[PDB]
Symmetry: D2
Subunit: 188 residues, 4 copies
């Protein structure tokens, strides 16, 4: 085709960035896909800034945002608030949408951040994909871990110093491959 | 054929009427098989008493499942909740993973759970690993501003009024037909690949 | 007195009109001080003027801007935001993202929090915008108040209307041309009075 | 008159019951208060209760009186406990609440404090969404919603796996229900009970 997977993210201290690398790695496990990383501007490198126009080109868009009190961050919100023209044109209708996040605390918006993000994706006419429980990481009870059936996640700790765990990255890779696979099936 | 199940609870018929519209829409897609299934209870229901009962096991046969429930204070009704609470074995084996899931509802008032009933339902569908489909704004009914209307981007809906005397409007039923066709199209694309 | 702050963002004035009604309701309770505050705009200068938003916003230009610090002084904060695809708008999001210091100091813990919104379509985030907003208020340790069904407006079935048990709302139509109805404003007044009453009861401990 | 707190819960294997006793202990700390635990009726067929072992586990708290919809009107605050079922409250709790249409139309719960706690098998399988979806129902009832403020240190624990959310206390049962509530989880529940009781008392003594 190739099937086009965009990973649109904002990262403050690298947790979402590292998770985005993992989502990307997973999507890249599926043949005939083109993975494009896009970063969200604040209010170097060759990761372009997301624009509303470019989102139209995707078959799937996987969004990553750190939480801000259980909602997506203002940087992501501001970017999405600029997609009214894209909405008017039906630009994302029928495309696969998926979300991953990061939080400071164990249950401070690990889930709510994602489900509230889903709302916006639904207004854009997207089909929503999370992480199924066929991924063993989701049921881990041996170590503190992110990862939700709604989408992958990581924990940054109170001071932002915690690095994403191998369990959390595995879940994100799973999410990427799963989203890419569904998108490819829908696109062919 | 692509298999679509429409699994619903209805007390006074509003959700049943919507389910028939969903079904009509689904059947507008080639090579699909659409089955209405009613959720067991824990006069109006006799008017559709020839619809078979849904069982948790049979869900595994569908490519898409479209769930209908009246609201109960912004959540699905207990009859539906009890049905879904019986899908633990199906969850264990990953029986609904990758199947298309979609929801429609009915409420008494204009903003008493027209949306929250559906989004809380989506939570459960995601635990089952389903692909969630709502109603895109390509459906004009969603932006109707000339009459009181159900219909949400999260899924179709109708309004029954305080006494339950209001019947689904043409606009609400057309939105439901669209959802049925939309879901069946997406499911067919998945089932064939 | 019991202090009620109504913090809002508005682009074309719908939320601002609802905010005035919320204020009016809150004032119906004795010994209350009600203050409107607005959040900073993020939209580029040229976009504001090109979209006609600059003109509408200039209408309420005299309203002071909220700051994180000032929020501490309230007994209740009622937040108004237009929906953006079923979430609060980025202007409100950015203001709240600046309240980390306030969060660390537990500055809004035990305060009454409440929300109202505005949407283009009948069921395009009339409810989900508000419930997602509640999430944030809970992280701040706020007590959440909506609109009880003792307000008859919530069950009106004779005319298209905003108003939810989660918080008041209005509908702006596809072109934004619809203005708040009397039913919608009445529900907002009730919300304001209901919130103020709860806040007063809690504050006078 | 004493502030009245009801803790209304469903439990299959006892996790929610244990959290409920911790919530109650916390509520009792405020003084001039009456805290009552009430359980909702079981829906599971008798044979299933027996073969699943649930009959036996529930018997451990079988003497807790059963809540009825009308009794809820007696409380200043109601704290609801439910295990998650795929990120919603369980059907037992749902059926009980579906029976509160009378209270709803009479405004019987308006202005009362409502609060929620939960239990899940996995770390992020509905620890939050079960609670936020519950809040929807409580808002239809016109209740004042209270969660758990971050003044509770347990919420930011990053040394051990723990439940506890700013939306309400929670515990983790593990994939097979083998995990029992931790001290951290019970501490958070205790705080929730005290916090809810404090808010309710302030509202109650200011009629
Ligand atoms: C970028 C953008 C996205 C919007 N998305 C929706 C939407 O998805 N659903 C909806 O019903 N209204 C939507 N609206 C409409 C509004 O929220 C807004 O026009 C209306 O509430 C006016 O409030 P205000 O005059 O205070 O700004 C959107 C508006 C904008 C600018
Ligand atoms: C303003 C602000 C508010 C936050 N509030 C919460 C919160 O309430 N609960 C929580 O668990 N984490 C909260 N966080 C934590 C972050 O989201 C965390 O820093 C993030 O996961 C870091 O990932 P990043 O490096 O990609 O930005 C907050 C962070 C910020 C900046
Ligand atoms: C116990 C109960 C609680 C209800 N609560 C609400 C409510 O809070 N908000 C609302 O808008 N409708 C509420 N309803 C109304 C319905 O959901 C309505 O009867 C339904 O749409 C009927 O569809 P059906 O005929 O297919 O069962 C409630 C109904 C019942 C029985
Ligand atoms: C039908 C069913 C579905 C469940 N689904 C989930 C789930 O999706 N996510 C989760 O984390 N736990 C899930 N659980 C596990 C429980 O909720 C857990 O066993 C419960 O908290 C035990 O509390 P109790 O002993 O008070 O009943 C499910 C349990 C059952 C029976």
């Amino acid at each position: 085709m190739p099937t086009k997977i965009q990973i649109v993210f904002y990262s403050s201290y690298g947790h979402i960035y590292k998770m985005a690398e993992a989502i990307a790695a997973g999507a890249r496990e599926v043949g005939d896909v083109e993975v494009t990383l896009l970063q969200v501007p604040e209010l170097f490198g060759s990761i372009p800034y997301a624009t509303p126009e470019v989102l139209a080109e995707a078959d799937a868009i996987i969004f990553g945002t750190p939480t801000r009190f259980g909602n997506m961050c203002s940087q992501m919100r501001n970017f999405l608030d600029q997609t009214g023209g894209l909405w008017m044109s039906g630009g994302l209708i029928g495309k696969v949408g998926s979300v991953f996040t990061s939080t400071a605390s164990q249950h401070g918006g690990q889930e709510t951040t994602i489900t509230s993000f889903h709302t916006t994706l639904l207004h854009h006419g997207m089909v929503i994909v999370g992480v199924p429980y066929s991924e063993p990481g989701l049921t881990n009870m041996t170590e503190i871990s992110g990862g939700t059936p709604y989408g992958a996640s990581t924990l940054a700790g109170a001071d932002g110093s915690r690095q994403p765990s191998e369990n959390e990255l595995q879940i994100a890779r799973f999410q990427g491959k799963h989203v890419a696979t569904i998108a490819k099936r829908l696109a062919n």
